[PDB]
Design a protein around this ligand. Structure first.
Ligand SMILES: *[C@@H]1O[C@H](CO)[C@@H](O[C@@H]2O[C@H](CO)[C@@H](O[C@@H]3O[C@H](CO)[C@@H](O)[C@H](O)[C@@H]3O)[C@H](O)[C@H]2NC(C)=O)[C@H](O)[C@H]1NC(C)=O
Ligand SMILES: OC[C@H]1O[C@@H](O[C@H]2[C@H](O)[C@@H](O)[C@H](O)O[C@@H]2CO)[C@H](O)[C@@H](O)[C@H]1O
Lengths: 252, 263
């Protein structure tokens, strides 16, 4: 199926051109009226057809060489990506994505799932040192285009798009990155909220709509690595700048 | 489908003015004891438990209202005997604790230590702003709005416009108090105030007093909307050169979007 897609060319790209891109990417995966406090809640396997099961992301590198990675509308996960008659799928790869994504290219699966821990272990490094930004993005798309697509470059993308798609904090972190044309490395906070998507997810659905207090607490992390426990929604938003909620439970 | 889950009780603090915490007088678990603002601290009278039934309480004595009528104060008394209605409370994301049955909200006439609280006619004021949380410590942040520029605070009674982001200038260091008010970190004496409720109304950095203008609700869409008047703060005609942030009917445009970045 000709799944919808968005584009973002690093060349002649400004901060606003990036912000708008993520916005469009959100307007797709973020549909349905199941939302709380305004923030939408990504659908689930049952309430979603294959015809709209996946979305395609188009990223054009400096040299024009553009690579595309399809995200899962049910979690903003990077399902796969293609490059010049070539397609790749993590060690998992379901027949759903293997028989509906980039049909026509070589379907050679990699050897590691899209799990953050999996990628890091394959790249021999961790997110806390895989600097992201304008140039880092270029090397990412490029590497995935020629080298066939390694783990490192992959991690560079995930945090740059889906991650910045749910967390506006990473958004401005990147918007400022291209603005000053400088790179940067993920801090303890960005990484903290990066691992508490599912946690804060139900922690917001638990309280319910138009509710501030949380039934529990979110284990965030400050720069000094110290624990930052957020008990209210207003706090979670004013810090993580979340804008996308993953399904965990339904209203009561 | 997949029903959620009934949440168990939890003990969280309460604040809503001058960084003052809500607690019971002398922490006396006796009935009738009223509620009042008082500097936060590790103590039961300051500790509050929330239940599914919609009841908040400390020391095991339900936090119920004393007499029902716009102007009545609050106090603690046994749950059982407590008036079925004068015991339930609602805490919306608007930073307000409104009493269902009645419709009044926990108001704080004056943000002074040892000041007793009291239900009143909800009019959307800093006084009627409360944020339940164990972390009574606000968070430092810069409001990056239009063209990746940060909101800057000039002089007292002066305006407030978008200046080149600088993570060093204290004028850009905004402190978000639990009372739903935005005060300058350098000097938490003045709060972001408006000059009216009509479109194009100019914004400034007036003093803090709990005025309905000093109330700012951070809409999840990314816009800092004013509660009293549905208007939202933005950049006049987008021209940052004009040097002025004002209230204006929502449009859903980027010139009305604001981000709050950590320290
Ligand atoms: C925002 O402004 C407030 C003040 O209006 C700052 O609060 C306090 O600032 C001091 C100075 O940085 C912090 O440490 C202090 O260090 C001195 C020197 O050792 C010491 O004498 C003081 O007793 C205090 O420990 C202080 O921790 C901090 N907050 C509190 C609750 O004490 C605040 O730091 C400003 N925020 C930012 C991001 O600048
Ligand atoms: O109402 C204000 C304030 O009262 C304190 O009550 C006592 C306190 O319990 C006692 O330990 C101290 O010696 O004297 C105080 C006299 O007010 C409460 O402890 C405090 O929480 C506030 O509730």
């Amino acid at each position: 199926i000709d799944y919808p897609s968005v584009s973002f060319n690093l060349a002649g790209a400004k901060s606003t051109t990036y912000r708008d891109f993520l916005k469009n990417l959100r307007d797709r995966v973020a549909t349905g009226t199941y939302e709380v406090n305004g923030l939408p809640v990504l659908r689930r396997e049952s309430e979603v057809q294959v015809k709209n099961r996946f979305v395609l992301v188009r990223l054009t590198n400096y040299n024009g060489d553009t690579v595309t990675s399809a995200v899962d509308v049910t979690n903003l996960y990077l399902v796969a990506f293609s490059a010049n008659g070539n397609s790749y799928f993590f060690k998992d790869a379901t027949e759903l994505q293997k028989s509906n994504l980039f049909l026509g290219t070589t379907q050679h699966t990699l050897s590691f799932t899209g799990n953050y821990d999996n990628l890091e272990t394959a790249a021999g490094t961790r997110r806390e040192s895989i600097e992201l930004g304008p140039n880092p993005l270029d090397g990412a798309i490029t590497s995935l285009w020629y080298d066939g697509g390694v783990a490192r470059s992959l991690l560079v993308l995930i945090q740059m798009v889906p991650e910045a798609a749910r967390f506006r904090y990473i958004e401005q972190e990147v918007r400022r990155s291209l603005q000053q044309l400088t790179s940067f490395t993920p801090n303890a906070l960005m990484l903290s909220m990066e691992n508490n998507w599912s946690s804060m997810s139900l922690e917001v659905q638990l309280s319910g709509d138009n509710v501030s207090p949380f039934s529990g607490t979110v284990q965030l992390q400050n720069y000094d690595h110290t624990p930052r426990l957020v008990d209210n929604f207003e706090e979670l938003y004013k810090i993580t700048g979340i804008a996308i909620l993953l399904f965990r439970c339904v209203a009561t | 489908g997949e029903t959620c889950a009934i949440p168990a009780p939890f003990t969280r603090r309460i604040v809503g003015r001058d960084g003052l915490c809500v607690d019971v007088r002398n922490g006396y678990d006796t009935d009738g004891t009223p509620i009042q603002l008082w500097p936060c601290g590790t103590q039961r009278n300051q500790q509050w438990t929330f239940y599914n039934d919609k009841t908040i309480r400390s020391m095991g004595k339900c936090m119920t209202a004393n007499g029902l009528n716009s102007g009545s104060y609050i106090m603690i008394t046994d749950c059982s005997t407590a008036a079925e209605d004068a015991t339930k409370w609602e805490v919306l994301i608007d930073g307000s604790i409104i009493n269902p049955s009645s419709g009044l909200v926990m108001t704080a006439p004056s943000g002074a230590s040892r000041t007793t609280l009291l239900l009143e006619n909800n009019i959307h004021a800093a006084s009627q702003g409360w944020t339940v949380s164990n972390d009574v410590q606000p968070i430092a942040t810069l409001i990056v709005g239009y063209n990746e520029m940060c909101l800057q605070a000039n002089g007292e009674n002066n305006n407030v416009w978008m200046e080149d982001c600088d993570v060093t200038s204290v004028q850009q260091q905004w402190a978000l108090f639990d009372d739903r008010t935005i005060r300058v970190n350098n000097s938490r004496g003045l709060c972001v105030t408006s000059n009216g409720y009509v479109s194009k109304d100019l914004i400034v950095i007036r003093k803090c007093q709990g005025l309905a203008t000093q109330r700012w609700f951070f809409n999840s869409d990314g816009s800092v909307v004013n509660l009293k008047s549905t208007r939202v703060m933005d950049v006049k005609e987008s021209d940052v050169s004009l040097q002025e942030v004002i209230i204006f009917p929502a449009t859903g445009n980027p010139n009305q979007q604001w981000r709050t970045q950590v320290p």
